[PDB]
């Protein structure tokens, strides 16, 4: 049992997780099979050539972040005895110089957030092996440095360098004598303004290209920005990309370009990926001759090049992105127009791979639907931020949001189409005619109040994605949504009335319905009262979150009518009751609880008393979770009521006794969370265990605990994650203490 | 010292707040000259002769929300001088028997009534205002509420008579002439017949609300009459109604409006259609020029279902309204409104207010509202302008004024909230009237303000931004408005760890309120202090001056060293542990209250309140404090109110009121006091951990000793040990 640090097999090697835990220094006690080590996020000062000992076959050492709440003390040469070290992460560590005398073993360095402003042949020359060098974040917006100095030819000795990272730092110029090797160049917010042809000859290798950043579009930037000045863009001269001809990603966002010269792709026929958002180029998107240069162009981005003041009928696309034979994915988000037609997307229309057109955030009145009918692999139709009315980390990209559009889980069905924050006030009659046929579909957040009676999605019958959290919607009438037979997943997540006065009632009985619905969310409904059907019936539904509600006003209604609201969701597995401000269930309400139910979620309530018993009700049952509740005690023979659950979650309750015979035996038991309670120790007296967690227990730390220790040793299969937080509040002497620190 | 209830004199009287404290019977220990007796929300589920024994000089018994209710037939037959008697949500099955003739408000609203017989109040002749709302409503138990003739035709000075949401069918026979205020709304009243209100010829105000209601996206059940039917009033239903102020007849599916109905009625004054379907009589209207004296019209909510009409037709018999103050059309529902749409109300002398809340209006000939003599509020939320190049609560019509009291004073009013201003238009503002007061709240609005955007409507003085993404980095912005004194940007962020730039705040030279709670304030560039000789207040909850304040280089230290003029500041919300110790020195010693609750606090430098002589409340809630100074005198005489309840403070230092002459109420509820060892007003004890042993039962005397001091909640100061005891409140043991 391993101790700071969790350890274990990855791949085919000993890890030690040994990341925040507020260690002030290297631990000595880490396991001898041990080749990765994460320290990171903890209070560590200092590092000298003992602290490693022991341990030479380290092979990566992360030291991110130390210490927290002046930096990290590393002395000279304190890693040039571990002759394996492929992979060194010093970032954020206040360091004001490149360590020296680095070991020339590595392959991977990184040393982004620091205070490092000379780049020294000293620092980094003997590392010939380096592929992965980061020194990004170092200087900028900063009293000192005025500006990164880069010894002349620092790298060139590094002939095995693929990537160099020198982004956010003030360059004002590119360095020269790049290694050949190269075939990743990071240079987003460098001051760098001006782009010579012999700035990137002799990088024949490279296929990723960032000058993001330099010359910003300030304009309502979020972080601190300092743009050219007379708004000038970057200034690329002609020929300075003519020997870049393996380039795959060009990264030009936020440079202030009104024109793109065509020429600087003349030698780039395999250019996949093209980022130009945060610049000036409504103009040359209206013609754009460059578009023409690109036959192999698989990703653009032209988003957020909106003209500030203005705010155009139409928006206008240039014939030439039909030659963009190989795009996949058109990113036009905020360019901010108002009527979009057939014929305005007409060069779109051919592209034979087009799936994603992305057009967020426009504040659109009017779109011509049918257009989509019109291309052969349209997958995502991203429509958020519009106003469609009804019809009768610095390890992140930084300017392209690259996280998916449509959550993976809606668009897996089929087409998928956001119309999430619109004006779609009600569902018009004619809101989705002349669309292709849907599988997926977002309506989140449109003020949205339809009485829903059956007809209103005729048009598009396929669904079976339906987002429709954030409305005010009214399902009253059994017929509503009847009309998608087909509908898997429904969210009515955070549905109310249009007034927000408490005393809405509901009728549930639309989903009674549907052959094969397989998840609906209720959460945050505020539901107290039923009309008419009490019950809620399904054949089909397999997972019903029906947190956020009155459960405890339902259950504790003295005519008993909500006994069996359930009973009837015959195939149910899980269920999450959360958010139901519950202090008891009715003994009989739980036994009419499905008895198909797998995972049962009652945490975050106010729970004092729970019949243990009842759990014989339910044989299937894997996963109970009773965290965040009220609970004073445990039932002292758990085996007798269950011999299927797997997994118990008691953490954040009141229990400060555990039963005799308890865990002896509990059988199937796995997992077992007992942390933040209030156990002050554990009997001998109280298996198939394999997590016991613990932690925020207030342990007293006497010989009486030594118990629990010599059984903790002798059960090293059981994990005990945490240790760290597993903490004697008594008796200080012992206080703050690990519970493994005794003897 | 009352217990348990609290009691204080007003005016001549002396009331006894008896209520939320858990009471299982109606104490005996009760002050003698008590006349207003309030026991609601409690435990209580019996009532007897002596259960108010030796209480004749009572006058209000309110026995609301307890716990059903069990009252013996003749229980307040002893009080001569009982009046009013509130009886609600009792579970009572039937009226109590043998009640006082004396009383002159009763109040059985909530309770299972299913019967009103004369045994139970014919003999109350001087009932005045008599309240059965709510007691046959949705439980099959009672088809329908059974109402004895001429049950009511005895209490001859009956003004007030509510019988609002219980199954009549029918208006009751028999209703006294005395009649001013007739409550029947949800009722089940499909028929009004000319001999229902037959010579009420005092009724000011009539309810039929509800009755065939527009059940359509109604929140709680509802059943139409059978077809979209409209209630059916007889032609002469209120023709002896003259004295009439108050008509209501929202939800009543009414297509139709006969202006007969207001023949002889030349008072009304407010009249309710909302809730209705008459889009249709909106366009024509005869009952629009039998109204000379209504001053509030309500239209509001007649959208036809699937309907989004270009534009909406005003009846020009809408200027036949000659007295009119208010006009309420919410939730019309249509696209554009043209100049000439709103001709007939230009003229129209007294109004004052135009609320088009709810229609989704995309565009507005805005001129318009300068051809208006007498404009105060112009009230255009939740609609789509875009960038231009309980039961006594009101279940329809919602009272709550539609701005906020303290803009709409500076003068004329306009809320464009929620609409589509997603930036700020360079013609968004001209053709608008004087503005004094604008909400230009949740548009999504991420103006890059500039100092030119308000020049139009340069006389605001309240401007409400909140939630939205302003970006006001240049020193210029909103300068224009330089008659500006109230600025609020709560809840403004970057539509994407963003940085502020201040300098705006100085160029201000009447500039009284800033508000920026929620903007999640971490650095200030270039500038770091904030500066003006006007602002009295400023909101800064939800910032991070726990960074500000850790800076390395100090910069942060006079943040607002220079806000001169400032007596509230509000640093709530900050995630503070500690403020360093001149940090805190240099804020305004202008300072009249200063809040620093929700934090982390662990410690508090007490002696630094010398620095602060005009300080009146201190307000330290909500945080980790351990410690109190034993000598508060010597650190301020101003001091008032110090409020540090929710902290670990288990010690109180002796004489530590004494002698801190200057404060008049101090909050220590829910902290760790075990115990209080050896010129105020008020002190919370109540959340605390009190060990009950014989040692300090001394607090308990110097209780005794200082009655002009208030403890409130003191059923909640509560024995944690040695318990038995644990439970017990304070004031019990021996
Ligand atoms: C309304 O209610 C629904 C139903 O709960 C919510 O939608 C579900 O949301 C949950 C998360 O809240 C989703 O669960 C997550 O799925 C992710 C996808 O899993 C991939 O890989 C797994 C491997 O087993 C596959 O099963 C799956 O097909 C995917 O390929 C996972 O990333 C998540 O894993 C979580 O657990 C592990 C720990 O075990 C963590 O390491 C992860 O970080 C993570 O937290 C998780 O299982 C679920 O898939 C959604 N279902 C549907 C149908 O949409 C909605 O969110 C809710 N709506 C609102 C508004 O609240
Ligand atoms: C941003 O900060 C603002 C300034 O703090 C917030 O506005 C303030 O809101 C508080 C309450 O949150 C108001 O105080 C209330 O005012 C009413 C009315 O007071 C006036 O009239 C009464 C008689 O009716 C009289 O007694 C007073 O003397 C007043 O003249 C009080 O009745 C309440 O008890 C309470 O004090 C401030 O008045 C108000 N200031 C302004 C300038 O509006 C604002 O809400 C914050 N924004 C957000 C989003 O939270
Ligand atoms: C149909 O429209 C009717 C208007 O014609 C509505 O009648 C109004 O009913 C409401 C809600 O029950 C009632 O509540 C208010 O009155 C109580 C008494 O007023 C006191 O306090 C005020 C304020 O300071 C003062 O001006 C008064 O003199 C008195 O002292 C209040 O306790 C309560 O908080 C509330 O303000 C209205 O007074 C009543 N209007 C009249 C003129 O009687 C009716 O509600 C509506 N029906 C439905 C179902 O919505
Ligand atoms: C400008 O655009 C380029 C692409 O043209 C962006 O390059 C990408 O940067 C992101 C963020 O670092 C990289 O994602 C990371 O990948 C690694 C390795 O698989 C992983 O360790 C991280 O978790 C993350 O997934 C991405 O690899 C890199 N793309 C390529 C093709 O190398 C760049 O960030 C943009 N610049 C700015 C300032 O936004
Ligand atoms: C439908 O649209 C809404 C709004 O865009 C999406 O909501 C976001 O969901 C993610 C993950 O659930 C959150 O982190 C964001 O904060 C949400 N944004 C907002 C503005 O609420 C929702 O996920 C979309 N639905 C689907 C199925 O993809
Ligand atoms: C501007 O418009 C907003 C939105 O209607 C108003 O916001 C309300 O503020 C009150 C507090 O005063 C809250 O109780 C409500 O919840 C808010 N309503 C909404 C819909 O958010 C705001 O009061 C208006 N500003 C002024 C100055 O009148
Ligand atoms: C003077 O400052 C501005 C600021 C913002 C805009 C915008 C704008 C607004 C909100 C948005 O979400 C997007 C994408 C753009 C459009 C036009 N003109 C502006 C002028
Ligand atoms: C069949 O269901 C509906 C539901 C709602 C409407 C609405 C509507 C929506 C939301 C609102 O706030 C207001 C005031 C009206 C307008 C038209 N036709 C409808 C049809
Ligand atoms: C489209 O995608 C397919 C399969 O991934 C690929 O074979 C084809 O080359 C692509 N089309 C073009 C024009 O590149
Ligand atoms: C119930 O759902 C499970 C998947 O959770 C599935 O294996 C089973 O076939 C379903 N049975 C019915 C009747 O829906
Ligand atoms: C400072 O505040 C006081 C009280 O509100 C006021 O009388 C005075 O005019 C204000 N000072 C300035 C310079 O505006």
Redesign the pocket.
């Known amino acids: 049992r391993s101790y700071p640090c969790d350890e274990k097999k990855q791949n085919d090697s000993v890890i030690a997780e040994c990341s925040n835990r507020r260690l002030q220094e290297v631990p000595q006690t880490v396991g001898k099979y041990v080749t990765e080590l994460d320290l990171s996020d903890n209070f560590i000062t200092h590092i000298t050539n003992e602290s490693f000992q022991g341990l030479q076959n380290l092979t990566k050492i992360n030291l991110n972040h130390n210490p927290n709440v002046n930096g990290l003390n590393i002395t000279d040469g304190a890693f040039l005895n571990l002759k394996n070290l492929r992979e060194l992460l010093l970032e954020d560590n206040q360091l004001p110089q490149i360590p020296s005398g680095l070991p020339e073993s590595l392959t991977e360095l990184s040393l982004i957030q620091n205070n490092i402003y000379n780049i020294t042949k000293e620092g980094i020359s003997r590392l010939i092996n380096l592929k992965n060098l980061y020194l990004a974040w170092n200087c900028y917006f900063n009293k000192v440095c005025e500006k990164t100095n880069i010894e002349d030819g620092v790298f060139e000795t590094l002939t095995n360098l693929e990537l160099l990272s020198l982004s956010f730092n003030s360059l004002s110029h590119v360095p020269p004598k790049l290694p050949s090797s190269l075939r990743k160049l990071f240079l987003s917010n460098t001051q760098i303004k001006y782009i010579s042809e012999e700035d990137f000859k002799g990088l024949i290798n490279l296929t990723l290209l960032d000058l993001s950043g330099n010359c910003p579009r300030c304009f309502?930037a979020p972080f601190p920005c300092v743009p050219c000045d007379g708004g000038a863009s970057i200034n690329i001269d002609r020929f300075a990309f003519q020997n870049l001809t393996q380039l795959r990603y060009l990264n030009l966002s936020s440079t202030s370009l009104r024109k793109i010269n065509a020429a600087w792709f003349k030698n780039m026929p395999h250019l996949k990926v093209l980022d130009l958002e945060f610049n000036y180029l409504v103009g040359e998107i209206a013609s754009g001759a460059f578009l023409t240069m690109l036959p192999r162009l698989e990703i653009l981005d032209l988003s957020?090049n909106?003209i500030?003041?203005?705010?155009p009928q139409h928006i206008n696309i240039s014939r030439n992105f039909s030659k963009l034979l190989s795009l996949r994915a058109l990113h036009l988000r905020?360019y901010?127009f108002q009527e979009l037609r057939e014929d305005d997307f007409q060069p779109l229309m051919q592209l034979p791979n087009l799936s994603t057109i992305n057009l967020g955030?426009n504040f659109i009145k009017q779109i011509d639907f049918k257009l989509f009918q019109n291309f052969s692999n349209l997958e995502i139709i991203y429509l958020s931020e519009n106003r469609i009315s009804p019809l009768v980390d610095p390890h992140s990209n930084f300017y392209h949001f690259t996280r998916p559009l449509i959550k993976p889980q809606c668009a897996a069905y089929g087409k998928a189409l956001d119309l999430s924050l619109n004006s779609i006030f009600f569902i018009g009659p004619n809101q989705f005619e002349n669309l292709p046929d849907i599988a997926c579909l977002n309506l989140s957040a449109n003020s949205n109040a339809q009485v829903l009676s059956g007809t209103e999605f005729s048009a598009i019958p396929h669904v079976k994605y339906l987002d429709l959290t954030n409305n005010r919607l009214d399902f009253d009438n059994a017929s509503a949504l009847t009309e998608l037979s087909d509908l898997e997943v429904l969210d009515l997540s955070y549905n109310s009335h249009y007034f927000r006065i408490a005393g809405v009632t509901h009728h549930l009985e639309f989903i009674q319905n549907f052959t094969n619905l397989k998840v609906l969310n209720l959460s945050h409904n505020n539901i107290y009262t039923l009309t008419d059907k009490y019950n809620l019936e399904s054949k089909s539904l397999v997972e019903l979150v029906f947190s956020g509600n009155r459960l405890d006003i339902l259950w504790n209604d003295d005519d008993n009518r909500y006994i069996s609201i359930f009973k009837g969701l015959k195939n149910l597995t899980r269920l999450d009751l959360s958010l139901n401000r519950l202090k008891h269930i009715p003994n009989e309400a739980f036994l009419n609880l499905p008895a198909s139910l797998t995972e049962l979620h009652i945490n975050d309530n106010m729970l004092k008393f729970f019949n243990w018993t009842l759990l014989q009700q339910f044989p299937r049952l894997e996963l109970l979770d009773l965290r965040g509740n009220k609970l004073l005690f445990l039932t002292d023979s758990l085996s007798d009521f269950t011999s299927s659950l797997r997994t118990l979650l008691l953490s954040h309750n009141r229990i400060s006794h555990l039963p005799s015979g308890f865990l002896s035996e509990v059988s199937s038991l796995k997992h077992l969370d007992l942390s933040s309670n209030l156990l002050k120790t554990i009997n001998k007296s109280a298996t198939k265990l394999s997590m016991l967690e613990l932690h925020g227990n207030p342990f007293e730390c006497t010989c009486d605990i030594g118990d629990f220790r010599r059984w903790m040793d002798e059960h090293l299969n059981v994990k005990i994650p945490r240790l760290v937080d597993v903490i004697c509040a008594s008796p200080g002497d012992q206080r703050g203490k690990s519970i493994v620190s005794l003897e």
């Open positions: 309502n957020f909106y500030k003041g203005s705010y905020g901010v955030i």
